[model samples]
Structure formats: C-alpha cells, structure tokens
Target chain A: NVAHGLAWSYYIGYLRLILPELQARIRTYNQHYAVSQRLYILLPLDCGVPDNLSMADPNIRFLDKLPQQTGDRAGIKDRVYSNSIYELLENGQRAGTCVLEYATPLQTLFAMSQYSQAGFSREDRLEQAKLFCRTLEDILADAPESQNNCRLIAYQESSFSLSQEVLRHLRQEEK
Target chain B: NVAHGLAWSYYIGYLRLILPELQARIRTYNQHYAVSQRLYILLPLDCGVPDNLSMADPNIRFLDKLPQQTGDRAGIKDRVYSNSIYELLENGQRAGTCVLEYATPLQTLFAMSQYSQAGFSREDRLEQAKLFCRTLEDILADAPESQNNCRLIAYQESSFSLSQEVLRHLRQEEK
Candidate 1:
C-alpha cells in the first residue's frame, strides 16, 4: 500500500507541476471563445436506461422519466431515478435530447488513456494519439458552425489542455 | 477533432457496456457500507492557490480567503477565489483541514493510468497495478478505526468499483 501511495503521490506531483501552464492555455482559449454556454452530458451511475438511447431520438423523454422496469434490479429502491443522462444546460436546465454525443471531459480522458494502449509500446501509443488528434480535427470540421451554441465540449478547462499536452508530447516523440 | 471524437465515443461505448455490472457491484458495496458521508475534494480550475497547500496546515484559511496577490496572474479577476481545495464536509460544511490525502476518485484514476507506465509493456502495467492495489490495502488498514467518520474516501460510487475491476483484471492476467 505504501508503494502504491508513493506512486500515486508522485504522479499527482507531476500534474501539479504541469497544471499551471495548462490552465494558462485554457484561460487563453476561453478568452477568445465563449465556453460559458457549453452543455454537459450528466450520466447517472445506476440509471437503468440503455446506453444506446439516442440524443437525437424525438420520442425520448427526460432521463429520469425513462422506464425503470428492468429485470436485474440492485439499487432500484428509490424508483425515483434521481440521476439522469440528460443535457445539462448552462443555466442548469435539463434537456431530454441534444445533437451532441454523450460524454464528459473526464470520460474522454479515460477513453484516451484506454485507447492509447498504455503499457504496450511507444509506437502504438504514438499511433493511437495521432489517431485521436485526427479524430478531434474531423469532429471540429464536421460540426456545424451554426450549432456553436449547442456544440458538445468534450474537454473541460484543465482536461482540454491536458489532452492537448499529451498529444503534443506524443507528436514530439515521433520527431 | 473528428478522430478524437470517434476515439472517445468508442471508449464511452466500451464503458457503457461494462458499467452495468460495475454499478451492480458498487450498489452491493454501498448496501454494506455507508457512502453517504463521503467528502469530495472540490477543486477550481482557475483558483490561483498553491496545489501544495496542506489541508493539515494550522494557518490554512478558507480556500477563497487565501491571498490572491500572486505575481503569476492569469484569471485572478474575482480575487474572491470562488473555488476551494478545502475538505468539503458531507453535511455541506466546508472544513479548513482533514487528515486525508487531497485526491478524488477521478484524480486517483488518472494517477493510476499515469503510474501504470502505459504504452510501455504489459509487465510494467501489471507491476504498477499491483503497487496501487497494495497501496489501497495499506490505506484501508492504516486508517484509524475511530475516524471512520473522517476517513478519506478516494473512490466514488462507480470509481471504487472501476478501480477494483481494473486491478482484478490485471492480477488475473498475471496468472
């Protein structure tokens, strides 16, 4: 346990060292772009709703209002479904549907780490990072400018910069 | 950005598939243990405060009250420091200090990924995972029995189970 604690402590120290610069970059980006109107996908941990539920579904109801009648019930006591996988508006409003994909910055980070094929090889890591970077570029280009107000911001303040930094590091390693 | 989006989307899909069982295990654990009193470490993205600010410090003030007169300025507009690193009491009270590590379940997950030396080799990954599992066990054992009320919960409802699942998978791979 002590060893694991040290390992994590060291990792936290590394983040502390790099966060200042990353935060600065995010601040700069926010200054030029209005990130205030961003919408977040709030996913409930225990919601019995199907993951395939489409945000584009016209018949979709509020996440909480979705049917809770599932066979594999564990923590379904409340039956209230206090948590919801809805689009949380900037003003704290909950919308049943949105055009954006359901994901958060933290979740994206987790995905990136998993996709990186960590502990595999540097080449694989670099390849995966490049793939993600290209995907991000494609996502941005394909997004409708008119929907800027509704654009899904997958990266948060620090996580945005963190993702960029990781990509940059991988790109640099290639050279 | 499109590539990044797709990469992240795939990752989310993977999580969605695995989440049901993980949620079930977490629900089971919650039934046997009290998780309602867990305190979260609320961190602000733009807070100018030092990351090393010890929660154990006797002179620690409310995170918002900390001196905002730092030379390295970026988003110091409010000078009010709306975000704090203080121990957020479960009862909605903000305490100055606690005998707990300043890490959240998500942060711990990030640290684990970083420590795993991902993209290196399976051996390194397994070694790092083992180290963390030991660390978690130590953290659980060293905790004061009387301070169960004040115990630092590093893992959240889902994150706790996620960590366990990852560790179990790695350990099984070894055999």
Candidate 2:
C-alpha cells in the first residue's frame, strides 16, 4: 500500500514540477510576442528547412516591418494579414513562407458556431477543440490555397500550441 | 436651481427606465438570431427601403444569422470577417442576391494594422478605434463596393453598436 501511495505521490510531484514551467513558458512567449498585437507565427507542420531558416541567419531577409513594404510584397496591400517572413531562405531562395496572420479568431468563432449548431450533441470544450480543428481542415481543403501549393499549414495567430512549437524550436536550436 | 436638479433627476430616471428595455431587446435579438453563433447584425447607416425594392428594393439586405451562407454569398467562402447587412430598398423586384459585405475581421485587423504602422506615435485604444474607423473608410472607398453602385451599408454580424441601431429602429417603428 505504501508503494502504491509513493508512486502516486511521485506522479503528483512530477506534475507540480512541470506545470509551473509550462505556465511560465507561456507567459514568456505571450510577453515576447505581445508587440505583434494578437498576431503570431504558426510554425509549419513540415518545417524541414535547414539551419539557414534561423532568425540568427542574416541571409534570411525580413521584409521590413513597415506596412507598405510587407503589403506590396505579399500582395496584401492593406496590411491586415500582412506580416510574414520568407521561411528557410538563403540569398532570397526559400523552402516555404509563414504569413503571420490574424486568422485565429474566426477559427475560435467557428467552434462557437459548431456548438450553436449541435444543440442535442453534448461535447466537452476539449472535444470541441478537435471539432474546431476538423472544421478548419475541411475549410482549408476546400479553399484555393489547397491546390495553390501554398497551404495555410497552420494559422499564424495567437495560439498556445503555436507558441509552444516556437518555444520548442528555440530550445532545440540552442541545444 | 431646484428645477434644474429635478430635471436632471428625471433625465436620469428616464435613462434608467429605458436602459432595461434596451438591454432586453438586445437579449431578444441575440436570442432570435441565436443560430448565428456569436454573430450579431450591424444595422444600415440610413435604412429606408421603399417597398418596390422588397426583393429588388435596392435596400441592401444583410444576413441575420449563420456564417457560411453569408460568407459564401459574399464570395468570402472562407467566412473570415463575414457578417453584415445593407441598407435602403430599391426601386423593387425578385431575389437571390448577396447584399455585399464589409464586416470581415480583416477590417478590424486593418485598424490594428493602422496602429502597427503608426507606432512610436503611441495612442490609446480610443484613439486607435478612430484610426481603425478611418482605415476601414479608406478601404471601403477604394473597394469595388464604392464604385459598383451597390453600396455595403452595414455588416450583419455581432456588433453591439449595430444592434443598438436596430433597437432604436424598433422603438421608432413602435412610435
């Protein structure tokens, strides 16, 4: 019985130890990117680009933070969903790009829409998160970007998971 | 001075009397069109639709509920910033048309975009709201809607101020 209790105690201690780090990391990311104003990068799912993609690499040019330049270059002249970077580039060559976007709220509202639809179907918020994900996937597949070779890969906006990926990448690069 | 105080008291009393009804009406509107999920209707700027335009009434129609239909009909198949209605009725006639749209969050983010550019100016949210409004006006003027003769008068989605206009209209109709 003591052995069982000890194992349970260790599990609880492990969770207690890890959860604060997780939360602190979240706090750090939100603060670090707060200047982006509700925008963030959705790291590409297939981000197989080489080390040249790092922010440390000067060859990876940034379209200047000025709205006009990013607008004209990306063809999003208004600059609403404008901020983006040419990912994995060397001397203007690239593997892909990530457009830092404001498309997250719609994805959230889409979940609210799903619940409004399914009155009889009871589901948890976690489950609804999955449903929201599927809804976005279906939407993206049907969208023009699907065949355009430029996919929405991830919504480049405020997301805990997205920030988590960024944190992971930064740590990995450091290692 | 006493008279002035009494008048002020009555004005406050009148406001108190009306606020609940206004709130109730809003509650009703949200409930009435609850299927639209989180979306609410933004009333037309000057909604005076003559009967002949009932369907053909040039009075721009806006969607009252649901996102996908409004989004697709507006050619915004992805439903980003999709919600809004048009004002004024036509000369009059048949149906099956979208009333044009300007309620996309891209417009809201356009406000955010404006501030992002105007940085170092360091403005408050109130100031930013004005900036956002101007950006949208600029965008709308440049948009095809301005030249097309079919104007987009209102957004038919989740705008509290918008529905406040509707509440005013409802009251006016009652009178």
Candidate 3:
C-alpha cells in the first residue's frame, strides 16, 4: 500500500510539473492563431475509480467506503478511471478544459511493482503504456473538435521498466 | 532584414530549448512501453530553401545564392520548406527519427511584422499558425507510420501577434 501511494504521488507530481509549460504553449498558440475556435490540450491520468465518476461534478463528496475490485480472469485487476481537464483561458475567461484520461492497468503495474512474483512482466507494462497512447489518439479522433484543435500529451509513469527488444518492436510496429 | 533574422533566431532557439525535455520524455516512454515499433517525433523547420531540398542529403553542400521567391497570388511570400526528423535511440542503436515540418507563412508573418503597413494583420498571422497546426495533423495522418507511432510538436515563431477575439474564435471553431 505504501508503494502504491508513492507511485500515485509520483504520477500526479509529474502532471503538475508539466502543466505550466503546456499551459504557456497553449496560451502562446491561442494568442498568435486566428481561428473560428479555441484549442484545448488533453492529458491522461489513471485514478483508482470507475470511469463514470466525474471529477468535474460538484455534487461528488469523499467517502470512506469507496468501491474496490479484485483481479480479473486474465489476472488483470479492476481499478477506477478518470481524466484531468485543464481549461484554456483567454482574457480571464474559460475557453475549454483539457481532458486527461488515466489508464488503470498502467497504474496497477506501478502499484504492483514490489511483487517480484507478480504475473505481469516488463513487456506487459510497456504494452499498457502503448495502449494508453493509442487510446488517446482514438479519443481525439472521435472527439467533437477537429483533432487539430485538441492536443494530446500522453502520460506514463517513469519508473516502469523497458527492454531493448521492446524498443525495437515499438519502432517496427509504427512503421 | 535584421527583424527577420531576429525572428528566425528566436524560433530556432525555442526549439533547441524544448528538445532536451522532449527527448527525455520520449526516452522514458520508449522504455516503459512494449511497442511493436519504435516511436518517432516529427518537427517542422522553415529554412529559406525549397521543399525539395533534403537536409538529410549528405551530397547537398552550401551554395552562394540559394533559391529565393517573392510574394504569391494570395500575397503570401515563398519560402523554403523542410522537416526535422529526430530518431528515438535505444541501447545506443538508431531506432527511428521524429519528423518536423516548418510552415513558411508563419515565419513570413514574423519576418514582415516590422512593416505596419504590410497587408497582413494580427488575425492573418493567427490563421497561418492555425493552418500550420492543421497541416501537421494532415501530415501525421498521411504518414507511413500509424499516427500513434508518429508524434508531432508543431513549431511557430513566438514574436507573432495574437488577439483576444481570435482566441474565442479558435475555441468556437474547434468545438
């Protein structure tokens, strides 16, 4: 549990570190470009909650007994999901929020890293990260805005391990 | 001419400043993800040469009088176009290169900013930037690699002017 908490903190901290730079770029882009619409950046996050829960909702309150789930048939575990949306502000007015989706499997990989005998491997974690990137692309394509107006900066925990063979595979598959 | 030089210097400097961070992130992403192929990032550069000129060509040498062009039918100036491709390296091996495309119009806007009497307005400059972003999206979609494998970080000069109304328009059109 302590390991999970540390991993989660690191993930959130990473987001906070990158946000200001992203905001500045978006602000600069918004100012210099003339368009019929404004742009928003979407980032991904993996909270340990269901996807239906809206962080933007005002009525939601903290609870002691949050729902939890065990491992699935494939040995994957159940987890909550949510996105962090940052609004692009112009002249002190909110233009639109940047939406970030957190992947549960990626987070689970981080949380379970302490278990040497865990069913997952480095290859498995890498796949989760790639899947998250693909998922972000799909979301932007299906989004209401033209993919042009919506920028995506896919997020992943840095502590995850990688192998040279996996790296080579990533390149070949993309080509 | 000095103004143009300054603008170009600033644009290139901005890219150099951001490259290290981007390289680091890409490196991290590559390590954690199990990808069938390695990922490449594409960046845009606007050299004052023709698009047909490949910077990657070793045979290409410095010339005394590089080709130059005047204004176009739309009053847009002719400039050289090219892309900067950065390869994601793994285990000291060459994995792949990231491709960047520099838009000529956006740079021209910065170059011509000194001429207040110039036909272009702040709105016009903004449109060029937005157009550049859209062009990047198109390029990625048409790229040989799946858009997922190709990351784009569109480049624009910072000196270009922006307006509040344009910001609102950007959001509306995107939505």
Candidate 4:
C-alpha cells in the first residue's frame, strides 16, 4: 500500500500541475481506502446540463428532478427491458406510422442534405419497417441462448406488424 | 517552439483526461485559437450520494452573463500571469470589469476549502483571502508599468469585503 500511496501522491501532484482549476482541492479524492472511485463523468452534458450545473449561477436557469439514486454502488443493475432497445423501438413505432405524414419534411431534410450518404437513407428506412415481426424473430430469437447478459439486452425491443402501405413513390424509387 | 508544441500536446491530453467532460460534441465554441477553457461540471444532486464522492465530481457551480475564457494557452498564460500579475489587471480593466468567475470550478469543490485551514481554533478565512489578494497585488504591481493606462486595481470583491469586515469586528471584540 505504501507504494500505491506514494504513487497516488504523485498522481495528485500530476493533476495539480496539469489542471489549474483543481489546484489544492483536488486532494478531496486522494488515494481512497474504501470503494474505488468510478466517477461517472456523464459528459459536457451527456444527459444534458448535468443534474446540477447551475446551482450557483443566478443568470442561467435550469430544471432538475433527481431520484435519490444520484450516487449508487456499481453492480449488475442496468436498465433492463425497461431501458433497452425495446424502449427505443417503442418510441420509433410512432415514427413508422407517421413516416408518410413527415415524408415531405424528411425528404426536404434528407433529399437535399449534403451528406445524405452518411446518414439515414430513405430506402433503408422503408425496408427496415417491413415485416418488423419476422425481423425481430430472426434478430432476437437466440437472445435467451447467450451466456452473458449483454445478449439478453437485444430482446428489449421488438415491433409488430407494419401498416402495409406505400405512401411514398420517392422512397420506392430508391429501393 | 518544439518544447512549446510538446507542452500543448500534453495540455490537450491533460484536459481531455481529467476534465474529460470538455471533450463533448460541443459545436458552439469552435474557435481553436482561444487559449483558455471555461467549463461547467454538473454536480450530482445530493452530497450524501456516495458515488459523487469520487475525484471527478466537483461540488460547486456558478453563472455569469459574460463568457468564461479558456484556451490552449493556459500553461503559457498562467506562467506569464504568475510571472507578472500587473498585466492581467490591466487586461481585465481594459475589458471593462473583469470578472474572475469560476470557469473550471476549483472553488465549487473542496480543493479551495483546504486554503480555509478549518483546523485552526480561530479560523482565519480573511487572513488567507488578504494574503491571496496581496500576493496577487505583489505579482501584478511589479509588471513593467505600462503607461498611464496601468491603473490601480485593488479590486475588493464582495466576498473579500465581507471577509475584511468579519476580521475587523473580531479584532474590536478582542480589544
């Protein structure tokens, strides 16, 4: 531990010399003896301006509602089916239904878009929505056979039945 | 120039490593030539949150109408400022009122709290504050006096003024 402690001291000094903003206070997180530090730096604002960025700022305003779970011990707890691809697909279903309604807008944005090749192509979107049920079977059929939890996560999303309507001649042309 | 180049490569790596939040896909401030970085780290909601105890989560946040200045030239600028505090004072005044807002939040967390010397029987927050200001004055006052434009920026902030007031009252009580 002495070796780690000395190396740790060097780490603290390294941070101070490197990042001026931390200065002396960087000591607060020094050489922990307890649970390891897994600081989840969620981002410049991954989920958006952190849960608490404007606590002291008077000019800029923010809204915050946090679960008591701001801090928690790490483990196997992740967003299960409740927070997986299923959630993404569920929300995406409306888009599937509304694709034609917004086809003009999507076309306006995508058709004339400079880097259309880099993003969602109109034909791809149409093809993916076809036989969502059969695709879910092929994609998630073996989700249960996987040994790790990661494979199981694939079942979090599945869609049923496409509307069976081709509203866009433009999208068909690409196919 | 080679040495400076190495220093810059290290600086970018430094900011990205410790304060990795600054590396987000922020499209707003694209001026690569700017020398200082202003960052806002969102703190977790509750202090009791054990996970927030890591070295990454700083405890304070503040806001101002003015844009916080940060850039790649921090090491050079800090060396220059530490070398000559006077020029910074003039620079601040030249830009009207210079607000030394907590761009990186060393103050929001415990790094600055170390300077508080809470261990002392009679905590001397003012003495430290004054020492900081005086050290600042000494650093800046000696800069090659630039012409009449070199003004006296004995800038007493409200926090500084309050600390001074507290000290005077305590001294009067002793008498």
- The candidate 3 chain B region of ten consecutive residues with least summed lDDT is B71-80
Please, what are the lDDT tens digits per residue for candidate 4 over residues B97-138?
Answer: 111111111121223234222122223333433333343234
Put down candidate 2 lDDT per residue, B1-175, tens digits, no spaces: 1111111222222222322243343355556542111112221222211222224222444434122111111111222222222333233431222222222221222222233221212233334333333443443353332332222234222323432333343334334
Candidate 3 lDDT, B68-88, residue by residue in tens: 112111111121111233323
Decoy 2 TM-score against native: 0.26
Show the lowest summed lDDT stretch of 10 residues, model 1 chain B: B72-81
- Per residue, candidate 3 scores C-alpha lDDT tens digits across A1-175 of 1222222222222222333344444454446542112222222333222332224222221121111112111011111111233333334443333332333333444433333323234444455445544544543454333334434344333342112212222234334
Q: Write the per-residue lDDT of candidate 1 for residues B16-95, one digit (tens) a residue.
A: 33223333433444465322222222221111112343332333323321111111111111111111223323234442
Arrange candidates by TM-score, highest first: which order?
2, 1, 4, 3
Chain B TM-score (each prediction, in order): 0.22, 0.26, 0.27, 0.25
Deviation (Å) of A70 in candidate 1: 42
DockQ of every predicted complex = 0.04, 0.03, 0.01, 0.03
Which 10-residue window in model 3 chain A sums to the lowest lDDT?
A: A71-80
TM-score: which candidate is best?
Answer: 2
Candidate 1, residue B52: the lDDT equals: 44
TM-score of each: 0.22, 0.26, 0.19, 0.19
Encode model 1's per-residue lDDT on A1-175: one tens digit a residue. 0122222322233223322343343345455532222222322211112234333233332332112221111111111111122222322433223222232222333333443332223234333333333343343343333133322222322122322322232334334
Query: What is candidate 2's lDDT per residue for A88-170, written digit by digit as tens?
Result: 34335643323232222222222222332212122343343333334444433443323322222242222224333433433
What are the per-residue Cα lDDT tens digits for candidate 4 across A1-115? 1111111222222222322322122233233211111111111100112122222122212221111111111111111100100001122342211101111111222221222
